[PDB]
Design a protein around this ligand. Structure first.
Ligand SMILES: [Cl-]
Ligand code: NA
Length: 129
């Protein structure tokens, strides 16, 4: 599925991401825009053999098991295929574990480069939440 901006914002709010571990909702919407363009089926291969999956581009070296990544740690204890659902629940639950790991949202390259340091509240402007 490709989410709309405010549709995703509302889904993320329903799943408890607003202000989770200190990160307001606009951070999460901005991250998803630049990670996946709001597409639940996005995938990207990396040079270490890992792949990033889904709307929040969760990596198979650490977080989910795809059966093809050497060194896999599967800290979210989920198959990576579950992260390609149109329902964001599995991705959000894993993202909560990632942000709790102690490096915050810095796990998301596109957030660190393109969202951090901007007015991320603008990403939820005009939405009914
Ligand atoms: Cl998988
Ligand atoms: Na893995």
């Amino acid at each position: 599925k490709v989410f709309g901006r405010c549709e995703l914002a509302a889904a993320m709010k329903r799943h408890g991401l607003d202000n989770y571990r200190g990160y307001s909702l606009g951070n999460w919407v901005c991250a998803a825009k630049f990670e996946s363009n709001f597409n639940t089926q996005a995938t990207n291969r990396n040079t270490d053999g890992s792949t990033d999956y889904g709307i929040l581009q969760i990596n198979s070296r650490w977080w989910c098991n795809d059966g093809r990544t050497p060194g896999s740690r599967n800290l979210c204890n989920i198959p990576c295929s579950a992260l390609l659902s149109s329902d964001i629940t599995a991705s959000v639950n894993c993202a909560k574990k990632i942000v709790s790991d102690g490096n915050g949202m810095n796990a998301w390259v596109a957030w660190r480069n393109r969202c951090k340091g901007t007015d991320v509240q603008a990403w939820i402007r005009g939405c009914r939440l």
